[PDB]
Structure formats: structure tokens, C-alpha cells
PDB file of C-alpha atoms in Angstrom:
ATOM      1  CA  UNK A   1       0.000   0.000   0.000  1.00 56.39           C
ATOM      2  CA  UNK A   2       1.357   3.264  -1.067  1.00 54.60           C
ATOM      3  CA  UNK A   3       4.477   1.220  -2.339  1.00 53.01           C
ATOM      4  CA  UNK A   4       4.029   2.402  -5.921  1.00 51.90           C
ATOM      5  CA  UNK A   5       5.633   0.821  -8.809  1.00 51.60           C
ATOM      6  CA  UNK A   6       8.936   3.056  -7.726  1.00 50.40           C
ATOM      7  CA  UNK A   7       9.048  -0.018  -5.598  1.00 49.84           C
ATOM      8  CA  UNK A   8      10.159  -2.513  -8.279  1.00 47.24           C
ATOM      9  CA  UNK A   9      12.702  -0.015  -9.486  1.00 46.37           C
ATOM     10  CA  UNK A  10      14.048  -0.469  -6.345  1.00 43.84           C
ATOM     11  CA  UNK A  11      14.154  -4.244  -5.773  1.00 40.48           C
ATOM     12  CA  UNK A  12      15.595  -4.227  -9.253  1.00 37.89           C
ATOM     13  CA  UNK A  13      18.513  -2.792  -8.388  1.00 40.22           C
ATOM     14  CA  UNK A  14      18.766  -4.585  -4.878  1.00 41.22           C
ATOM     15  CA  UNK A  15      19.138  -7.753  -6.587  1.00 39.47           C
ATOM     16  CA  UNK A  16      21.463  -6.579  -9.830  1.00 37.00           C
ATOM     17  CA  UNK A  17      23.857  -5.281  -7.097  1.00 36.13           C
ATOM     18  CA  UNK A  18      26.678  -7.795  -6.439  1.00 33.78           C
ATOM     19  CA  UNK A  19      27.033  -8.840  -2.328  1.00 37.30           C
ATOM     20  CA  UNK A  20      30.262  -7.148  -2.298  1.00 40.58           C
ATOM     21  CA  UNK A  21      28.334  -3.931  -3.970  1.00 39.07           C
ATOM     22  CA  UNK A  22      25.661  -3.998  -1.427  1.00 41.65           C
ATOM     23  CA  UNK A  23      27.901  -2.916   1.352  1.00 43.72           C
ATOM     24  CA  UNK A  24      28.638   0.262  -0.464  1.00 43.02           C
ATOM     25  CA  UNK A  25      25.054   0.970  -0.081  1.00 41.73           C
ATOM     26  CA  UNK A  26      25.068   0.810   3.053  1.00 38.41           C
ATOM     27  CA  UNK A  27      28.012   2.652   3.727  1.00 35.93           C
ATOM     28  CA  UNK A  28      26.795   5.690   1.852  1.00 37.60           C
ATOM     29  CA  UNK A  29      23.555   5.624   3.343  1.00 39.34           C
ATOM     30  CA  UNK A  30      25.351   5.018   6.811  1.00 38.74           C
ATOM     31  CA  UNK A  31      25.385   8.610   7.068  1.00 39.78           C
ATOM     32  CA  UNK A  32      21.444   8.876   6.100  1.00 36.58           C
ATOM     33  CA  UNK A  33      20.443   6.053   8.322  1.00 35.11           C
ATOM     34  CA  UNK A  34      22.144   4.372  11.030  1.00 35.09           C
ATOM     35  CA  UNK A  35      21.724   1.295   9.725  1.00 37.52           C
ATOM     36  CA  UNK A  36      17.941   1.286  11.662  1.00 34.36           C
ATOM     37  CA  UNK A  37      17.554  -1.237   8.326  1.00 33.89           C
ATOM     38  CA  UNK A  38      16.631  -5.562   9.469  1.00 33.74           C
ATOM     39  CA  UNK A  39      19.145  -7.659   8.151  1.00 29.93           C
ATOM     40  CA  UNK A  40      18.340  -7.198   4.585  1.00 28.61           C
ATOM     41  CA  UNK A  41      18.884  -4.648   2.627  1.00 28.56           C
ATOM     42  CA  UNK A  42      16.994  -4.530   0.190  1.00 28.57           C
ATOM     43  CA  UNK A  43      14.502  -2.736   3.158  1.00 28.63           C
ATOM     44  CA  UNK A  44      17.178  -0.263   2.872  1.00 25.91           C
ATOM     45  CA  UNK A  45      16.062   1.516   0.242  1.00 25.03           C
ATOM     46  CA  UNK A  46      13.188   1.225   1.248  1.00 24.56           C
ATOM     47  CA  UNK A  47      13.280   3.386   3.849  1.00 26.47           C
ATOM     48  CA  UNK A  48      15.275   6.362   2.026  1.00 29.55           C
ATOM     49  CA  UNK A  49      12.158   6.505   0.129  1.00 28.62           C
ATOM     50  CA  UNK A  50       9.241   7.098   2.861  1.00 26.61           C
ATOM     51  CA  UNK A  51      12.139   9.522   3.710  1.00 29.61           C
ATOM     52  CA  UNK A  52      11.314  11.376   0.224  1.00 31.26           C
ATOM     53  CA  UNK A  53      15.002  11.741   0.714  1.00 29.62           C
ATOM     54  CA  UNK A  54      15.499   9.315  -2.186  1.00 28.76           C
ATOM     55  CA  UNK A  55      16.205  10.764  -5.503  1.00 32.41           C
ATOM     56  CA  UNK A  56      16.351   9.613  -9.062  1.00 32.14           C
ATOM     57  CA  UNK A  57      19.349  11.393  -9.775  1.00 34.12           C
ATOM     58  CA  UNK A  58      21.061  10.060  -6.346  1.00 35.98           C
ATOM     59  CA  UNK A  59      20.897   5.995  -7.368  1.00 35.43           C
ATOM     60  CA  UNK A  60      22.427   7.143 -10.515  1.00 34.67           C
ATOM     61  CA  UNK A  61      25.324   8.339  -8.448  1.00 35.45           C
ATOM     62  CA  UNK A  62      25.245   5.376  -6.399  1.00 34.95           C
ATOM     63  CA  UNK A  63      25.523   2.766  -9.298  1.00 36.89           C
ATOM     64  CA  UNK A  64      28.481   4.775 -10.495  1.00 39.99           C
ATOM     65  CA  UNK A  65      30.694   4.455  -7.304  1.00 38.07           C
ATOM     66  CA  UNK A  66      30.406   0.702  -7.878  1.00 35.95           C
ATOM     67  CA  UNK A  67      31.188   1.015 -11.340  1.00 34.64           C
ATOM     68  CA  UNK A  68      28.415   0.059 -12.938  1.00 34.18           C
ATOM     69  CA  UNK A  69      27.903   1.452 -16.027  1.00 36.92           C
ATOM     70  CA  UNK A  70      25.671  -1.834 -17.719  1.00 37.00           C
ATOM     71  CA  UNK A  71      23.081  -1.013 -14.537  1.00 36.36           C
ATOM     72  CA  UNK A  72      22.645   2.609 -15.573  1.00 32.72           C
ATOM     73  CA  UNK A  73      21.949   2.173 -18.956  1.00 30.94           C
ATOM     74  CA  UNK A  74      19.556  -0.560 -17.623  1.00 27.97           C
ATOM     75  CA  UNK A  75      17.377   0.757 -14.721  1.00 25.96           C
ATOM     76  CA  UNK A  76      18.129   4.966 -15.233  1.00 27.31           C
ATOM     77  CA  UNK A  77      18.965   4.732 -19.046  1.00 27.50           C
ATOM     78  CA  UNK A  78      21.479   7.097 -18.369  1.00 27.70           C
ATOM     79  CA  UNK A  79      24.863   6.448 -20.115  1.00 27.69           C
ATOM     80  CA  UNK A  80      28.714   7.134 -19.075  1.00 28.64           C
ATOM     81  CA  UNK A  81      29.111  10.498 -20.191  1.00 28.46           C
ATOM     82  CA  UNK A  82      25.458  11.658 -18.084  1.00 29.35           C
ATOM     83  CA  UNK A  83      27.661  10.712 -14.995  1.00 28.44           C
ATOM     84  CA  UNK A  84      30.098  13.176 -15.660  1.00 28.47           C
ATOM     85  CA  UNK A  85      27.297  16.071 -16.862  1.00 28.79           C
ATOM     86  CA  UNK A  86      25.296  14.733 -13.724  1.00 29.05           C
ATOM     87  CA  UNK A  87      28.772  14.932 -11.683  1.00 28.84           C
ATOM     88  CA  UNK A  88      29.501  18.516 -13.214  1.00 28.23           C
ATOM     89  CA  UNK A  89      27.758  20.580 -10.967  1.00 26.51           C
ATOM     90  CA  UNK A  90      28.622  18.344  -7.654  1.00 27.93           C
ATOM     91  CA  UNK A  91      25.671  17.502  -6.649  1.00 29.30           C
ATOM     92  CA  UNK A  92      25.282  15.385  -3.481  1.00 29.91           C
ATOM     93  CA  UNK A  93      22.106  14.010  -2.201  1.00 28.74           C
ATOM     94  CA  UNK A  94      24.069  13.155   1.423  1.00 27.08           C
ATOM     95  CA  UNK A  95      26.895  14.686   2.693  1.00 24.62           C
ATOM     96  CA  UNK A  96      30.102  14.108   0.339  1.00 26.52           C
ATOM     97  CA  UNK A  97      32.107  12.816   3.294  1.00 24.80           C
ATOM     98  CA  UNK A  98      30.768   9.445   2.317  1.00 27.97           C
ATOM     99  CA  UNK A  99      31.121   9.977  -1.306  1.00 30.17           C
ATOM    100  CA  UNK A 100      34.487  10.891  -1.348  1.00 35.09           C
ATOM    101  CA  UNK A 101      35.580   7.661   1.149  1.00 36.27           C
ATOM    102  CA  UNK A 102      33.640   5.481  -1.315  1.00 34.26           C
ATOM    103  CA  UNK A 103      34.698   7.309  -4.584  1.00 33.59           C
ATOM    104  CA  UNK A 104      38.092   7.056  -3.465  1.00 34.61           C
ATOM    105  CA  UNK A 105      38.458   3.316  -2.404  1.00 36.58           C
ATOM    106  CA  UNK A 106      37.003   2.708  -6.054  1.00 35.62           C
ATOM    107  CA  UNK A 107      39.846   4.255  -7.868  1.00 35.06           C
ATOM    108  CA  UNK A 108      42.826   2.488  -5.466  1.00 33.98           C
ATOM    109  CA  UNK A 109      43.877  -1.100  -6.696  1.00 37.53           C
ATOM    110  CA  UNK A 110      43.820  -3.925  -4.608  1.00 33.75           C
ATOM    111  CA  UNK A 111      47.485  -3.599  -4.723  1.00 35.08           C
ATOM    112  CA  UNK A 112      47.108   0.070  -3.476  1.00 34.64           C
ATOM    113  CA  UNK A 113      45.468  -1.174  -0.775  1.00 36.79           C
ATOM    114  CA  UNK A 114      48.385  -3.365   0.777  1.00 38.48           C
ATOM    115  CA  UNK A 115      50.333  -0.515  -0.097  1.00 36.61           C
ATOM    116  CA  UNK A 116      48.760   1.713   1.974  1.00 36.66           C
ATOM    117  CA  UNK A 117      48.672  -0.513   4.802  1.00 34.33           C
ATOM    118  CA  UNK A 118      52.161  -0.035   5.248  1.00 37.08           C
ATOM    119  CA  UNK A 119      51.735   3.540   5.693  1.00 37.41           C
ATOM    120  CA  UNK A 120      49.827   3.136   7.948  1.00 37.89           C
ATOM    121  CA  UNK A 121      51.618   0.534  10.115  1.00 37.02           C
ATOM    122  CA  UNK A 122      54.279   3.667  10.771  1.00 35.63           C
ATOM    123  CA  UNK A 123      51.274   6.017  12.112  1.00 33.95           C
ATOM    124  CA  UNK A 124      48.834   3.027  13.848  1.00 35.65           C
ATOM    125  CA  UNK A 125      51.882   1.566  14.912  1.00 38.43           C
ATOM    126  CA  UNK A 126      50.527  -2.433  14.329  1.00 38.41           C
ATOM    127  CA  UNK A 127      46.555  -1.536  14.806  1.00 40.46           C
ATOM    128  CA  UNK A 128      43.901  -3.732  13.813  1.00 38.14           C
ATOM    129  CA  UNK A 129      44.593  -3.568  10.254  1.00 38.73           C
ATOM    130  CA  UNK A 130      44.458  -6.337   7.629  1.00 40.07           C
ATOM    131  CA  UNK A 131      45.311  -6.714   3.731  1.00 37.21           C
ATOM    132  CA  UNK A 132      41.903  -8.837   4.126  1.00 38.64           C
ATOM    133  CA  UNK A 133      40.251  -5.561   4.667  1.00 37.36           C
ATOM    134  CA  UNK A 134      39.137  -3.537   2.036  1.00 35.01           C
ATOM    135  CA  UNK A 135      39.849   0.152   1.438  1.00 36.43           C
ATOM    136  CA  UNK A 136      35.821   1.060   2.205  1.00 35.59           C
ATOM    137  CA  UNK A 137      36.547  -0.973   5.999  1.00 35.66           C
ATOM    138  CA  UNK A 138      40.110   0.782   6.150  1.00 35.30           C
ATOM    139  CA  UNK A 139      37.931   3.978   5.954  1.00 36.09           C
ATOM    140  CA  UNK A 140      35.698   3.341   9.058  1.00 35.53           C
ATOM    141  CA  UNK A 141      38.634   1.347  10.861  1.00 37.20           C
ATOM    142  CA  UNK A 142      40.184   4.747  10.977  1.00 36.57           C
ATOM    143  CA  UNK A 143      37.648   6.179  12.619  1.00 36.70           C
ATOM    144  CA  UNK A 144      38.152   4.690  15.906  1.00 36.38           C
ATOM    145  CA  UNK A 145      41.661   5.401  15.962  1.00 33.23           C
ATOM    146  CA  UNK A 146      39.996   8.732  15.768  1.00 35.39           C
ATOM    147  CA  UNK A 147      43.086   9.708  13.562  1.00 36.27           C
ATOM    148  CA  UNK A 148      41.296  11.781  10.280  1.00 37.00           C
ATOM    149  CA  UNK A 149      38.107  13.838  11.273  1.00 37.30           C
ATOM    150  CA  UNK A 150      35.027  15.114   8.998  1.00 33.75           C
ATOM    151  CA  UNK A 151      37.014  18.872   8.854  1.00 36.97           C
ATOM    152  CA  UNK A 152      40.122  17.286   8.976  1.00 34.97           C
ATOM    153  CA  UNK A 153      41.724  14.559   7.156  1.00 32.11           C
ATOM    154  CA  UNK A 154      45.584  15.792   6.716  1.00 31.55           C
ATOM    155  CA  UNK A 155      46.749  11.912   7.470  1.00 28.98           C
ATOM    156  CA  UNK A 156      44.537  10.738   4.059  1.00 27.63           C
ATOM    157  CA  UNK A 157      46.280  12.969   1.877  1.00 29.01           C
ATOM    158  CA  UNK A 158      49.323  11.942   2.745  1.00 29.19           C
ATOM    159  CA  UNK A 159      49.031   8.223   2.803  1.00 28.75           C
ATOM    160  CA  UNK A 160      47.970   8.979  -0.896  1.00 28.65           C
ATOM    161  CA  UNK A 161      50.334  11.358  -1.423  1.00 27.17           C
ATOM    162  CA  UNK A 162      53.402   8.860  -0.997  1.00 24.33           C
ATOM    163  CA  UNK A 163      51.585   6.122  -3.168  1.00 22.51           C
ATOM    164  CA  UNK A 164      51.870   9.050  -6.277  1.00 18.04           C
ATOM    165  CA  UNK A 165      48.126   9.545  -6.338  1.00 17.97           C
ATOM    166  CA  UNK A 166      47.984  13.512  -6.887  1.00 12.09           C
ATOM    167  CA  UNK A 167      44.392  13.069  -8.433  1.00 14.58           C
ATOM    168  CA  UNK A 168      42.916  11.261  -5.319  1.00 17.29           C
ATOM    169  CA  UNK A 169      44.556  14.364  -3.545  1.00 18.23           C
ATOM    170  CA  UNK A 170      43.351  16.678  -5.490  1.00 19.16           C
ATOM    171  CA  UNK A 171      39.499  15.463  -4.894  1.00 19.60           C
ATOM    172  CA  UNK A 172      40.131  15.514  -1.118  1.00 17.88           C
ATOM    173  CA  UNK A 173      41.241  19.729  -1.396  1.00 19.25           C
ATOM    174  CA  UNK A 174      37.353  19.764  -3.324  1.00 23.42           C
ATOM    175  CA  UNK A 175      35.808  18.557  -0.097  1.00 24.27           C
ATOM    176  CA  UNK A 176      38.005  20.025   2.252  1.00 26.87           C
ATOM    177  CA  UNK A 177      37.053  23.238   0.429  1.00 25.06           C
ATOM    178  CA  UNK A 178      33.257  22.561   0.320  1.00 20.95           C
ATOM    179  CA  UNK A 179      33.887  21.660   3.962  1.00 19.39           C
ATOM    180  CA  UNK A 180      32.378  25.360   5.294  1.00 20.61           C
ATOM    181  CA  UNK A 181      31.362  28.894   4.233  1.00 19.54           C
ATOM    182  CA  UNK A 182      28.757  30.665   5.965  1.00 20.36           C
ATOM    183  CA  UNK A 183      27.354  27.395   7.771  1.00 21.11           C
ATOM    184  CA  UNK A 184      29.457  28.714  10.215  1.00 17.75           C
ATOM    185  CA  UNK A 185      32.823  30.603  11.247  1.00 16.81           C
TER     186      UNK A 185
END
């Protein structure tokens, strides 16, 4: 009742997302909801849209983080190059913090991720960190070192930095950036 046929839409992409995809979803939407979704998750979606916070243009972005182009062209209809046009003006249905994390595990290499283990071995000093972990779990591991903040990442950029990533750096000075203006002083 009330479901609507947006509701297929939804399970459609619920079950074209891979179980290694899925957690992406839930990471970017860990900001939105604290993970108040059962078990499943295809129920999160679900409840982004009583929200009404849950956009078409949004899922668009969210199929491109895990590189889905096929699933676009498929459920949106909305080829490569509408990501960047769609991507042109920034827009962010949540937050970019999560974005960026996400954004930026995608474009590091599983081999860049053992590589920037070691970094961080020198700074955690031998923390729970594992090459079994991937870079989206690095990304919330960090947080309870407490050792990168939502203002204030400095230890990011440099990890990157060293593995000769300039263009990962160069997104985190966007958000950094976007970070404040007249939200507050």
C-alpha cells in the first residue's frame, strides 16, 4: 500500500547489485540512516524513500561508485558520459564525506590497498589492520583510531600522497574546500 511501482525499481537494483556492492550501499547511506535497516537490505532503500530523501538522480550516483555502467543504462537509461554532466555541478544528495571515502576506495587497486597498509603501520603503529580488509573498511577502521576527522583529514592525503596519487589528492582539497562557508565561522 502506497508502495508504488517506484518499488520494483528499487528491488531491481537490490538484486542486480553484487554482495560485495551492497555494502557500499550501506556505507553511503550510513550517514542517512544508522543502519535502523533488518538484516536485509533490500529494506534499505526502502526506507530512504518514505524519507522522500530518495532521488532519481542520487541511485544514478550510487551505481556509479560501484562502477556500474551496464546497470545505468539498464534501470536509469542514463549512459557514461550523463555521470560526468550529472557529476559537473557536484551535486550530493548526502553529505560528500561518504562519497568521497567510497569514490576514493574505487579508484585504489587492490594492490594500493596493501600498499597503503604499510603507511599506515608507521602512524597506527601495528593496529587492527588487515590486507583482508578492504579500502571502504580501512575507511571506518580509521575512525576509531579517531586519527582523520570530517574537517580534517591531513593523514589521508598523505598516505595517498606517498603512493603518487595527486588526483585522489586533489578530490580531497574539493571537499576540504566545500567543507564550510557561511554554515558557520
Amino acid at each position: 500500500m502506497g508502495r508504488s511501482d517506484s518499488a520494483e525499481v528499487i528491488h531491481q537494483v537490490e538484486e542486480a547489485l553484487d554482495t560485495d556492492e551492497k555494502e557500499m550501499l550501506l556505507f553511503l547511506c550510513r550517514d542517512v540512516a544508522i543502519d535502523v535497516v533488518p538484516p536485509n537490505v533490500r529494506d534499505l532503500l526502502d526506507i530512504l524513500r518514505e524519507r522522500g530523501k530518495l532521488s532519481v538522480g542520487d541511485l544514478a550516483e550510487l551505481l556509479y561508485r560501484v562502477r556500474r555502467f551496464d546497470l545505468l543504462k539498464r534501470i536509469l537509461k542514463m549512459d557514461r558520459k550523463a555521470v560526468e554532466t550529472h557529476l559537473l555541478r557536484n551535486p550530493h544528495l548526502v553529505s560528500d564525506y561518504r562519497v568521497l571515502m567510497a569514490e576514493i576506495g574505487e579508484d585504489l587497486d587492490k594492490s594500493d590497498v596493501s600498499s597503503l597498509i604499510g603507511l599506515m603501520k608507521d602512524y597506527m603503529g601495528r593496529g587492527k589492520i588487515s590486507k583482508e580488509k578492504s579500502f571502504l573498511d580501512l575507511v571506518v577502521e580509521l575512525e576509531k583510531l579517531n586519527l582523520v576527522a570530517p574537517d580534517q583529514l591531513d593523514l589521508l592525503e598523505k598516505c595517498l600522497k606517498n603512493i603518487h596519487r595527486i588526483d585522489l589528492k586533489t578530490k580531497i582539497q574539493k571537499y576540504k574546500q566545500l567543507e564550510h562557508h557561511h554554515h558557520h565561522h
